[PDB]
Design a protein around this ligand. Structure first.
Ligand SMILES: [Zn+2]
Ligand SMILES: [Zn+2]
Ligand SMILES: [Zn+2]
Lengths: 134, 114, 46, 266, 65
């Protein structure tokens, strides 16, 4: 506890002392490049020359989103999207590398334009650790 | 995240023996016992009983770093006495003292009515 | 009974396909939420 | 009778007040330590959530479920999962509990520890029962529901100790004091005017003779006679926290001898 | 959020004692000091647990879904 640092009762921490929740919202849209040329939320795969991410696409459903129960980690793909070029090129959203948690809430709506808009919230319980500030 | 497993605190690892006995080079008829997966719960208690032994010339224990449950116990005894035996005896002395404390609590608890 | 999406306001289980109108059945609301996996999640009671 | 004597003052289903005489401080303390940290209890350790419509996060509820006290009287009959031979858990090493609640009332619907139901086979041992202590007999309030707010989950209760998670804390605060009249000079009392006037007297001051000014300092004096007060959470009855406390501490010292003997095989 | 199961410091179960603490204050018209005492919250570590707790759950329940 020397020099503006402190000792914390672990038996207290266990009982839920100074314990907090954490949420992060990831967002995406199906951009319209010109006319009828639109992006598509789906679970992509090895089809011609798509530059897909190095994360787990397997956590995505057919709609190209995680179900709000699943535990997500590392660079696990949480929003699957594809942009076409004149087959398909990857436009997926991985999780923040430096983060991990459980999918809390997936929200599928429409943008003012009339295009698919999606928001993904991820939950984490953070526990008071050794280098934590107070 | 860089945090150990809570159970490591008491559960011996791969090839981890509860005791590691090494002779103290620095002094004659002296030893250093490394008690793995233990704390002051046992260390202070063993040291105290070792101190009761007349034939024990030295007894101390240290918890080198709080991240790891282990302690070194140093025992130096009078010539013609194995410190192992001093600890062997000091242990029985704790158990026998505790066995008495159990029975004498059970006696006093049976006496109570609330 | 089939579960894919839920409404935010009225909260009526919707279940619609890719390009099948983002609006809700009953109330003309464009706000939708996803199911939650049938993949039963486990936690440590700590 | 033999060696360290115990003198019980007050007793209840929750608190044991006693005087531990003819002991070595280190022993009284090491029991104190064991009582908290190393006595084995049963508490939920795995929470598999089927469905949650609560205003409460899955893990939040999961945490609380661990904290809930569960019967441990015959904990010795249950194996630690770790040493059991099953793939994950079985009836020999675990107690399965199911929680299923729903807001059928227009009013708020409450979820309590009484709402848990043991789904595993108990083999007759008094284990896994959620501890209820309140007048109304509901136990610990887990959470509150609305209307369509539903909660369905499965719990796997396991043998464990406070060194792992304080949820396996068979004991609450343990009171511990000795030499109320500071005759041993173990404390140098901080003051502004009078040392004695400023510092309150203890209850245990009645149970010890004051020194009387004219007496010199007893340097031969050693610390024995410890006024202690144990408090059971409920998992194991108060007496058994003191008894198992002694037994666990014994088992330990014994395990040293057992391993010391195995060293003398090579 | 909701009455914590057990006091952080000592582990005394304060989780059950909530509803009765609310009744002692409302119905019995007792003061916050005597209420906690009658409930058997002896040392102040537990006293703070209930006395200083905010039961936000009730406000979250108010929102429709
Ligand atoms: Zn609707
Ligand atoms: Zn088993
Ligand atoms: Zn407390």
């Amino acid at each position: 506890n020397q020099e503006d640092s402190m000792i914390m009762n672990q038996s207290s921490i266990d009982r839920g002392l100074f314990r907090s929740l954490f949420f992060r919202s990831y967002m995406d849209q199906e951009k319209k490049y010109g006319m009828s040329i639109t992006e598509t939320f789906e679970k992509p795969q090895r089809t011609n020359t798509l530059r897909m991410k190095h994360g787990t696409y397997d956590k995505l459903d057919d709609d190209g989103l995680i179900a709000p129960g699943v535990r997500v980690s590392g660079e696990d793909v949480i929003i699957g999207k594809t942009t076409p070029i004149s087959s398909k090129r990857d436009a997926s959203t991985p999780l923040r590398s430096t983060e991990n948690g459980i999918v809390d809430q997936v929200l599928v709506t429409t943008n003012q334009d009339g295009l698919k808009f999606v928001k993904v919230r991820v939950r984490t319980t953070k526990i008071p650790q050794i280098g934590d500030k107070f | 995240m860089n945090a150990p497993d809570r159970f490591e605190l008491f559960l011996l690892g791969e090839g981890e023996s509860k005791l590691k006995i090494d002779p103290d080079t620095k002094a004659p008829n002296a030893v250093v016992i490394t008690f793995e997966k233990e704390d002051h719960t046992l260390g202070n208690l063993i040291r105290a009983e070792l101190l009761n032994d007349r034939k024990v010339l030295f007894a101390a224990y240290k918890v080198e770093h709080p991240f790891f449950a282990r302690f070194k116990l140093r025992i130096q005894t009078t010539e013609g006495y194995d410190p192992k035996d001093a600890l062997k005896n000091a242990c029985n002395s704790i158990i026998n003292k505790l066995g008495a404390l159990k029975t004498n609590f059970e006696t006093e608890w049976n006496l109570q009515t609330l | 009974a089939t579960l894919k999406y839920i409404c935010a306001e009225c909260s009526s289980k919707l279940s619609l396909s890719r390009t099948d109108a983002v609006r809700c059945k009953d109330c003309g609301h464009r706000i939708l939420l996803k199911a939650r996996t049938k993949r039963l999640v486990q936690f440590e009671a700590r | 009778e033999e060696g360290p004597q115990v003198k019980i003052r007050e007793a209840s289903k929750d608190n044991v007040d006693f005087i531990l005489s003819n002991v070595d401080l280190a022993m009284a303390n090491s029991l104190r330590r064991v009582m908290i940290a190393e006595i084995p209890t049963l508490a939920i350790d795995s929470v598999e959530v089927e469905t949650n419509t609560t205003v409460l996060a899955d893990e939040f509820i999961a945490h609380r479920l661990g904290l809930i006290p569960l019967q441990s009287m015959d904990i010795e009959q249950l194996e630690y999962s770790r040493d059991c031979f099953c793939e994950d858990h079985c009836d020999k090493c675990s107690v399965v509990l199911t929680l299923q609640a729903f807001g059928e009332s227009e009013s708020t619907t409450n979820v309590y520890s009484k709402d848990l139901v043991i789904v595993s086979n108990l083999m007759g041992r008094n284990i896994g029962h959620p501890i209820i202590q309140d007048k109304e007999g509901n136990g610990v309030l887990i959470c509150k529901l609305r209307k369509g707010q539903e909660l369905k989950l499965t719990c796997v209760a396991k043998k464990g100790i406070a060194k792992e998670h304080a949820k396996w804390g068979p004991a609450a605060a343990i009171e511990f004091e000795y030499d109320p009249w500071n005759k041993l000079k173990h404390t140098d009392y901080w003051y502004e005017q009078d040392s004695a006037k400023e510092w309150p007297q203890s209850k245990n001051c009645e149970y010890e003779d004051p020194p009387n000014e004219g007496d010199p300092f007893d340097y031969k004096a050693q610390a024995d006679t410890f006024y202690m007060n144990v408090e059971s959470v409920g998992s194991i009855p108060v007496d058994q926290v003191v008894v198992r406390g002694i037994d666990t501490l014994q088992k330990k010292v014994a395990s040293i001898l057992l391993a010391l003997t195995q060293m003398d095989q090579d | 959020m909701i009455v914590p199961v057990r006091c952080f410091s000592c582990g005394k179960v304060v989780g059950d004692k909530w509803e009765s603490y609310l009744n002692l204050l409302q119905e019995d018209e007792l003061d916050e000091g005597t209420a906690l005492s009658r409930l058997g919250l002896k040392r102040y570590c537990c006293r703070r647990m209930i006395l200083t707790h905010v039961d936000l759950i009730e406000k979250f329940l108010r929102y429709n879904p």
